[PDB]
Amino acid sequence: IIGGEFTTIENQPWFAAIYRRHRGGSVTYVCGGSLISPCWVISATHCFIDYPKKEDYIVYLGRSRLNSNTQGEMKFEVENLILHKDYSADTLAHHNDIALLKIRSKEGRCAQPSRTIQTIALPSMYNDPQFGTSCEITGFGKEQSTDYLYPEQLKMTVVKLISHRECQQPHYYGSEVTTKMLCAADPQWKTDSCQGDAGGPLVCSLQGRMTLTGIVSWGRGCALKDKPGVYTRVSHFLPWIRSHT
């Protein structure tokens, strides 16, 4: 997250921190995800496409720090890693960038709600906030495009939804963005998601209900003029989610 503010897990209790084991046993951060139900975390396919093996991943819930445990956090194994079969990757635009991870602890249990662990509601089909609406994003991604390290403390910021016509414009992303995608950014391009934030949630208040409107997917650089963050439009993949869950 470029700009924005630091936060702890209680301000995004459905945020999931996903890591991967390497040969030798070293563990590195992979991407963010969102708990949509006790046993299910939704993320982005591009995060796992190069390493499809579910056994290599570890998922944490109620975790506020990148490399240090958070009191009360839960650790999970990935019982099933479901990627979207229609996934595609272009110059930058990832299509159908959505994935599902079925979590299971070593005790064979799913998530246990608490003050630091809760689920986020899915939107109604094809029901998104009006463009210009302010929503929030969360993640452990870079704080600066040139940074080498990722922040140790979770972060969040606010970005406004951009209309498809605006984003489809030449100056923006042209045709790289589709109806199954949502663009969002700061009117001053001061804050935005960045490398490491993929898979994370774009949450909007829709009719008094915090809703998982999008999933951090892609973008040209970070916090650059006319280059918004692009998000998987969740309200357009409900049938997919339904069946796979």
Ligand X SMILES: N=C(N)Nc1ccccc1
Q: Does 202 bind ligand X (CB under 6 A)?
A: no
Under 8 Å CB-to-CB from 170, ≥6 apart: which residues? Answer: none
The residue nearest ligand X at its CB is 219
Residue type, 173: Y
Per-residue contact flags (x/-) with ligand X for residues 206 to 245, judged by CB under 6 A? ----------xxxx-xx----x-x----------------
| Residue 165: CB minimum distance to ligand X, A | 19
Q: What one-character DSSP code corresponds to residue 239?
A: H
| Residue 216: CB minimum distance to ligand X, A | 5
Instruction: For ligand X, give the closer residue by CB, 122 or 184.
Output: 184
Piece in contact with ligand X (CB under 6 A), picked from 118-126, 127-135, 195-203, 237-245:
195-203
Report the SS3 class of residue 5: strand
Chain breaks in the chain (C to N over 2.5 A) after: none
Residue 200 dihedral angles phi and psi, to the nearest 5°: -70, 165
Instruction: For ligand X, give the closer residue by CB, 57 or 218.
Output: 218
| Residue 115: CB minimum distance to ligand X, A | 29
Contacting ligand X within 153-192 (CB under 6 A): 192
Positive or negative, the CA dihedral 145, 89, 51, 217 is: positive
Q: Does 33 bind ligand X (CB under 6 A)?
A: no
C-alpha span between 86 and 158 (Å, rounded): 30
Among 101, 117, 194, 234, binds ligand X (CB under 6 A): 194
Residues 137, 157 contacting (CB under 8 angstroms): yes
Q: Does 32 bind ligand X (CB under 6 A)?
A: no
Q: Does 18 bind ligand X (CB under 6 A)?
A: no
Under 8 Å CB-to-CB from 4, ≥6 apart: which residues? Answer: 155, 156, 157, 158, 191
Among 96, 116, 168, 193, binds ligand X (CB under 6 A): 193
The encoded tokens of residue 180 equal 């199954």
- Tell me which residues touch ligand X (CB under 6 A): 192-195, 197-198, 216-219, 221-222, 227, 229
